[PDB]
C-alpha cells in the first residue's frame, strides 16, 4: 500500500552519485549524515514519530552503511571503496590488524553481490528492510514498522521475477544475505568499541554518538 521501488531507487541515487582504520572511521562519520538524508527519502519513514525514527537509525546504521560500501565495491578487485574517495586494499586491511573482518566483507557480501549482479533497486530495498526493523527495542508501535517492512519486501519480490523472471530464487537469495549482514554488522561494532576503549584512532562526533548508550 504505497511503497514503490522507484522511490527507493531514487533515494539510493540521491545520496550516492596511513592507518586504514582511521580512514574507515572518517568515512563512517561522513556517511552517517548522508544516511539520515537517505532515510528521509524512504517512503513513510519521516511520517513515523521522531523517537521511532531515532530508534530505527540507531539500530540499523552499521548494517545500512556496510551494505552500501559493499555494493559500491563490486567493481573493485580485492578492496573496498570508501565514500571519501579512498580505497582500502585487502593487503592494507591485513597489515592493520583488521584482515579477518575485511575478508568476511569481501567474501560474504561483496563477492556475492558481484556474482548475482545485485542492482541498485535491490540494494535499496534490502536497506529499506533493514531500516524498518520491527525488532528494534523501544519502538512505540512495532506493528507499524513491521507493516512497512512487509510492504518493502512485497515490492522487492514483484520487482524481482518481473525484472529477473528467469531467476525464481533471486528474491530469497537477496533476503538470505541479511543474516551475514547482521553478523558482520555486530563484529564491526565490537571493533569500534575496542577502538574507542583503546583510545587513539580518532572517532568523530556522529560516529561517537552512535556508540552512546544504549
Amino acid at each position: 500500500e504505497d511503497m514503490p521501488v522507484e522511490r527507493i531507487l531514487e533515494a539510493e541515487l540521491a545520496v550516492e552519485p596511513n592507518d586504514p582504520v582511521t580512514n574507515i572511521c572518517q568515512a563512517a562519520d561522513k556517511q552517517l549524515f548522508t544516511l539520515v538524508e537517505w532515510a528521509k527519502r524512504i517512503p513513510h519513514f519521516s511520517e513515523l514519530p521522531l523517537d521511532d525514527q531515532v530508534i530505527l537509525l540507531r539500530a540499523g546504521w552499521n548494517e545500512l552503511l556496510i551494505a552500501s560500501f559493499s555494493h559500491r565495491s563490486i567493481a573493485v578487485k580485492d578492496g573496498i571503496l570508501l565514500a571519501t574517495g579512498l580505497h582500502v586494499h585487502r593487503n592494507s586491511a591485513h597489515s592493520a590488524g583488521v584482515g579477518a573482518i575485511f575478508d568476511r566483507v569481501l567474501t560474504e557480501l561483496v563477492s556475492k553481490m558481484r556474482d548475482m549482479q545485485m542492482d541498485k533497486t535491490e540494494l535499496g530495498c534490502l536497506r529499506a528492510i533493514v531500516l524498518f526493523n520491527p525488532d528494534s527495542k523501544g519502538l512505540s508501535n512495532p506493528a507499524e514498522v513491521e507493516a512497512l517492512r512487509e510492504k518493502v519486501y512485497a515490492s522487492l519480490e514483484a520487482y524481482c521475477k518481473h525484472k529477473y523472471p528467469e531467476q525464481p530464487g533471486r528474491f530469497a537469495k537477496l533476503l538470505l544475505r541479511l543474516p551475514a549482514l547482521r553478523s558482520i554488522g555486530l563484529k564491526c561494532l565490537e571493533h569500534l568499541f575496542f577502538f574507542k576503549l583503546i583510545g587513539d584512532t580518532p572517532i568523530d562526533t556522529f560516529l561517537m554518538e552512535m556508540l552512546e548508550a544504549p
Partner: peptide
Amino acid sequence: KHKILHRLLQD
C-alpha cells in the same frame, strides 16, 4: 541524548 541525530531528522 542523541543530539546530532535528532537535530538532523527534525530539520
